[PDB]
Amino acid sequence: KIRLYQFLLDLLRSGDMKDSIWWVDKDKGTFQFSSKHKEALAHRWGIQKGNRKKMTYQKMARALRNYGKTGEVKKVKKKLTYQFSGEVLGR
DNA sequence: AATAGAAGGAAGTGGG
DNA sequence: TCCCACTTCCTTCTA
Numbered sequence: 001k002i003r004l005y006q007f008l009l010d011l012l013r014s015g016d017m018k019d020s021i022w023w024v025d026k027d028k029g030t031f032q033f034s035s036k037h038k039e040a041l042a043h044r045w046g047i048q049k050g051n052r053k054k055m056t057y058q059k060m061a062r063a064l065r066n067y068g069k070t071g072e073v074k075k076v077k078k079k080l081t082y083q084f085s086g087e088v089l090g091r
Numbered sequence: 092a093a094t095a096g097a098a099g100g101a102a103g104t105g106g107g
Numbered sequence: 108t109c110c111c112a113c114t115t116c117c118t119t120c121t122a
């Protein structure tokens with residue numbers, strides 16, 4: 001099963017949910033969620049994982065925060081904005 | 092207050 | 108056994 005950071009990177013590459021997520025500075029790996037359309041993206045994550053309950057953005061962001069230590073994804077001090085690591089981007 | 096973003100401890104679930 | 112990689116629940120805190 002796909003890892004969350006890869007799910008997000010793949011969405012950004014394909015462009016299939018451009019109203020819910022977008023690059024801010026793609027060279028730096030910074031990206032941002034839509035305030036109004038993030039929940040539809042969270043729902044898609046939960047359905048792709050086959051989880052028991054409906055996925056929410058809050059729960060998806062709780063998972064994102066766990067990457068802070070290992071570094072795959074870090075929180076940017078901007079509303080709804082995060083940053084992929086160079087290692088994640090290279091793959 | 093209402094709305095909403097952000098944090099994180101802790102317990103539960105998956106698939107090795 | 109026991110870590111992976113989250114998921115779920117709840118409370119707190121900040122803007």
Ligand SMILES: N=C(N)c1ccc(OCc2cccc(COc3ccc(C(=N)N)cc3)n2)cc1
Binds near residue numbers: 079
């Ligand atoms: N578990 C703890 N003890 C804990 C410790 C620290 C915490 O801090 C939370 C926090 C940190 C930084 C920034 C923010 C809020 O940011 C916002 C940005 C933009 C908007 C907007 N324009 N609508 C609204 C809010 N909230 C929370 C709980």
